[PDB]
Amino acid sequence: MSLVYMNIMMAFTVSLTGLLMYRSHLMSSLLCLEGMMLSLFILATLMILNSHFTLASMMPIILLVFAACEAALGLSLLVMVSNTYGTDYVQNLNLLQC
Amino acid sequence: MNPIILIIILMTVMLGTIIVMISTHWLLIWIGFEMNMLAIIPIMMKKHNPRATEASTKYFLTQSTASMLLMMAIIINLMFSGQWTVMKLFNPMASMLMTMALAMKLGMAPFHFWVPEVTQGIPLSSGLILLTWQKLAPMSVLYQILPSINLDLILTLSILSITIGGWGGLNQTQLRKIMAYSSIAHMGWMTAVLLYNPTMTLLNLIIYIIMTSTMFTLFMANSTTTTLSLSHTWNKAPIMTILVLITLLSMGGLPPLSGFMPKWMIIQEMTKNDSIILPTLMAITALLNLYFYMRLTYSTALTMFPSTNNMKMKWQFPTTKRMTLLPTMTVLSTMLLPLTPILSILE
Amino acid sequence: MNLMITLLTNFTLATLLVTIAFWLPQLNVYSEKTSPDPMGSARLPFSMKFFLVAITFLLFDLEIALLLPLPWASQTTNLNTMLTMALLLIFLLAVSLAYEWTQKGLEWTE
Amino acid sequence: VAAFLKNVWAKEPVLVASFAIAGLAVILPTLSPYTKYSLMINRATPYNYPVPLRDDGNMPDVPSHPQDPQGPSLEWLKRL
Amino acid sequence: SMMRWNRERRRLQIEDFEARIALMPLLQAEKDRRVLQMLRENLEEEATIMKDVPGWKVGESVFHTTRWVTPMMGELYGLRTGEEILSSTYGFIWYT
Amino acid sequence: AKTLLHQYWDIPEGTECHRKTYAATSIGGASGLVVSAYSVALKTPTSFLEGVARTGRYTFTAAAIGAIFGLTSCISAQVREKPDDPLNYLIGGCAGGLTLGARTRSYGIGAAACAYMGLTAALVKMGQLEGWKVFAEPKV
Amino acid sequence: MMTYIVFILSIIFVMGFVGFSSKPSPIYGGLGLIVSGGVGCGIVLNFGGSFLGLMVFLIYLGGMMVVFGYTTAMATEQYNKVVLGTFITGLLMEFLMVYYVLKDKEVEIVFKFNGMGDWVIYDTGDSGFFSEEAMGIAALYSYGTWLVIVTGWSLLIGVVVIMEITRGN
Amino acid sequence: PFFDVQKKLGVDLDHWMTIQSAEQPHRIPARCHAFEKEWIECAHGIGSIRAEKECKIEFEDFRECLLRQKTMKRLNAIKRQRDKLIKEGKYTPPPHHSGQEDLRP
Amino acid sequence: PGIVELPSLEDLKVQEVKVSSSVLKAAAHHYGAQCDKPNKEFMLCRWEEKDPRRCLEEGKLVNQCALEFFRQIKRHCAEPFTEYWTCIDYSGLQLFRRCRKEQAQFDKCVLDKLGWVRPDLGELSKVTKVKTDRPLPENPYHSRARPEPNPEVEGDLKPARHGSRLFFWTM
Ligand SMILES: CCCCCCCCCCCCCCCCCC(=O)OC[C@H](COP(=O)([O-])OC[C@H](O)COP(=O)([O-])OC[C@H](COC(=O)CCCCCCCCCCCCCCCCC)OC(=O)CCCCCCCCCCCCCCCCC)OC(=O)CCCCCCCCCCCCCCCCC
């Protein structure tokens, strides 16, 4: 298939493995999650423009809006963790081991 | 929480699951999962302690990862089919990604690693919603894509869920983690029979939701989250020990109880398809789930652990908690095996 | 293509003026300065209210993103449905504003 | 109900103007004689090519030429 | 004022669209002969290039159907120069 | 690693000992790398050197189990001249169990791994013989 | 070179993700995702997605990543080998993909991929006096009624949900 | 559980965006409208198991319309052999493949 | 698969309308009024055959009828037409509304010397009927045979023989 689709899929997998290998910050995890969402937006957009499938052109905007709402929810969770420990470090989120 | 806001948020949880169940477009499937997660996050943060914020953060991260893998599976389906019908997928890569996404949303092993934490971090009612209502939408999507689900992948997920949910509950003393590892093992049982007969998948899901709702309703009616506080129930309310006895013997699949009903039927549908080793090892691994159920019945009904003195004050008050459908769910989780051929209503 | 030329010219003029502004007084040899804030050394206190107005911006901006195809949407032949859903989206932005109002979310940055 | 209106018009006239403009925007397209013409103009606008019909022999309401009398006319739009 | 002027602008839009409609059969005939010209040129040059290659059928359709498929961009401008490729595939996107 | 098991089963029993031994060694090495990957995943080592030491230990342990399994099974099928016989994989599984006990430096684990892995390898041979399906395709 | 430009932008796009997947700090991570959003927007714009590209700017970058940078600015107090090694690793993996598919005109990571420029697969016609992408987005109000209902309900629920969980009571 | 509420009530909540061959604004066709119409009208009602083997040809034509893998592979072959014969000196382009001929209309 | 059938380059030779787009836009309404019939025959053939290779000759008739349109302008009214398409040609959007007096002079000269009436607002967008002698394409999509459907359900529903037949249950 098309050569640009390779790069958009590979970008999704790069942001996946960034989201699947944390360092310390929860914000870096949220950024990897939104990089995944951005790559999904780009790939859906290039297909829908490429196929001239007219009614799915509203689809990526929906894919934006919901997920950005999702992002807002994630930011609030980070802030609540940041209102508990002072930082957003994921190693402070370990009370549920016992 | 404001009760009007609580009602609107719970109707939004239900509306997300309904939009997953009734829609014919993959974007509306993804939208229903997004709406379900977005509305269920405040139900988990109902009490505002750091454990609920940690549980909601872990739940958000796993369900958001699953939603993004779901949308990548949808987008690859759009690549290789040009359409959006919620049916079989037209690429094994999209099938693998959607099976991974739904195994994450169900918390099947080895994506189980959020289920015992999050259930421990949230209250018992939100744990009831997580372990019963949050299974219905991904099992519906698995119900509709079973022409494209790889056999080896879903059976590996099934046996790994049954074994890990067996060995996980053997070390536990918290009741919510016990119900969570029980959840993992039962989801393994439900997806092991998905490609063979999905009616028995629906049967196992309904019987599991009845038994789980019975156990969480008993845990709420007695205000018990640990084994050792459940062991004070005989000195407070001796009927509840008999109820947790018969319901924990039913969740272990001991006949003549109703929880013997699914797994037997599952074996009954896996030997027709000439699989003998697999339901045998599944049923042998279910003895682990039975073992920690028997541990709880020894702690609660069949012996009497020592109580404290302040229990004498709690004798002077009856339970004013709304035990909604608790006799109904107790009957329907124990005495239902003579009505086993009712399962054809799920065909 | 003309747009890419124009963006490159604007970026090049901006980078040129920034390089000139950062390196024209560096040619002077003025002195080396030692120089050993209202807050003394205290950590940045988080305010919940700035985060609430930023999230309220994001949510109303998503509602704006839904509202943006209206000048093209008015050209449809299903005008009753288009008008109903347009008034419904502006009404849901208004209901989000009213719920943000009446639960004290717009307070001390009103 | 009249004292409430003067009270909120003295205290919060921005919100009174807001709910008044919003209420007019809601109810007034269902009361206007020109709302029919918006639909009529949007369906009179030819974005597409008017793909012709194969003449079978019995279509007296379909013209053979654009300057034929039968067919949809737009004198209502030229006049208004 | 906006009522009168937008109604006149809609009448002007309909006049422009009717001019477009009246010109479209000439443009469609020219476009059909244009794309068949380019495909026949590509077919003849494919015939005079792909002679050494074993088992090559010149003009072999990749579709099992015998229906006319609308030609792709690379099917028309694949053998031509990259300047015509750019001026036929990014020009409207890049035009100002 | 689906082709690993196929190139293990493609050689007939008691015929080519070296490539059977190498195929079982490679299958054990793949399984040991899987165990090593999940082990350094869920349990963080204190260093990179400790992590690769755990990885090499588990990989060499499982590879030695596979090597001595395939060697003992093929030599038993050679000297007994019985290729379709699950007693050969019984002795091979017990040899791999003694290998696991020597790697864990303990005799009780060795006898347990002998018994259970010998029964497991006998069951795998019987499933190869009578066509037992564990991932059975849906037929009805 | 200019016939490959969308592909070239995609390369920068992948490099941009290796900018923040290596996770140097959430602030440089936000900067890398902003640059990635701009170049992926350019990819969208070079197919004719003008409205969708300006949604990448206005709503993703100008709306959402502003809130990411804003929230990040209210954490991580203002003043690696792992980031450097992962960055050069992703760089080398992407340029090895580039080298393979440019010397072979075919590659196969998971699927087969052509090595020509992606201009080849476009359409050779016109849309008349409209943009097809614009009319398909404008049909959100005519054809997308249920989609508008569930989207607006999710946004209203999102406002309510943020005001619940951020209250702390 | 696909509770088919849309067919039970007769409402169209999401069938309109489901296929490319559906009703589109201003009757804009998809680039693979005809192939998808043929694949759907082949595969309609006969079930998916019979559709995978009795309608494979229309599905292959439709997938090859969508992704153009055979077309791009054929253009790769022609362009690669063409540049190889340019390198060998055995081929020269015509004037109408160099831009010297004042195009048609 | 099979070999695609392209027509020869001789089958694509026709006398081209080598005028600019403002010349075409200035003459557009009279072109739609006068060159109605072969244009609509061609576009009927073009939407029915779904193949340009089955539509060449009618297309040539379009390119035959356009030229006879322009010669009949070039013989009689070259000055008002030139003065009108130049003014149409000035505008970057080629507005009709900027050029109403040159339009009025061109319409006056054409209606006097040729009797052509300019079409009113609404007329050129009508759906017209076309009487052709070419046949209707019976399979314009070149569709092959469709598969036979599965056999439907018929017969009155009898009860289940011995009930569920589940292991020991008699009902
Ligand atoms: C003029 C118009 C009006 C005309 C009226 C005509 C009638 C007048 C009399 C009205 C009353 C009629 C009653 C129904 C008809 C007779 C049904 C019957 O006896 O079936 C025998 C049934 C089958 O034996 P059969 O000799 O082949 O059939 C004789 C007839 O042809 C049976 O006929 P069939 O072949 O058509 O039967 C169909 C099928 C026949 O059965 C089968 O095809 C085999 C499958 C049966 C279920 C096996 C499940 C095994 C696993 C679970 C075991 C649970 C634990 C056992 C009990 C523990 C303690 C509660 O039935 C079922 O599958 C339904 C399940 C069994 C329900 C039987 C009716 C119970 C109603 C009262 C319940 C009270 C509690 C009972 C104990 C709870 C367990 C049932 O026997 C058993 O399954 C053994 C267990 C006994 C069942 C209950 C017996 C009913 C009377 C109970 C009175 C004592 C209550 C003491 C206090 C409460 C318990 C502590």
Ligand SMILES: CCCCCCCCCCCCCCCCCC(=O)OC[C@H](COP(=O)(O)OCCN)OC(=O)CCCCCCCCCCCCCCCCC
């Ligand atoms: C093919 C199948 C398709 C689908 C079929 C239908 C599936 C239905 C699945 C139902 C799942 C129900 C999940 C629980 C109910 C949802 C709301 C909830 O959790 O309510 C609990 C409520 C909260 O009150 P609160 O005050 O917060 O409690 C804490 C005390 N301080 O109140 C309490 O805490 C009070 C304690 C009692 C609450 C128990 C409510 C149980 C209701 C469900 C019964 C079981 C399901 C129905 C039967 C099976 C149907 C398949």
Ligand SMILES: CCCCCCCCCCCCCCCCCC(=O)OC[C@H](COP(=O)(O)OCCN)OC(=O)CCCCCCCCCCCCCCCCC
């Ligand atoms: C039906 C059409 C569509 C309607 C929805 C869309 C409207 C568009 C505008 C959206 C506005 C969104 C936010 C509105 C929130 C209203 C509630 C409110 O603000 O109550 C609090 C306020 C007292 O103010 P306070 O709490 O102190 O806040 C600081 C400012 N002083 O209390 C007040 O100030 C009292 C204000 C309420 C009474 C207003 C009456 C206006 C009457 C206008 C004419 C009739 C209009 C009929 C339409 C329906 C009216 C209900």
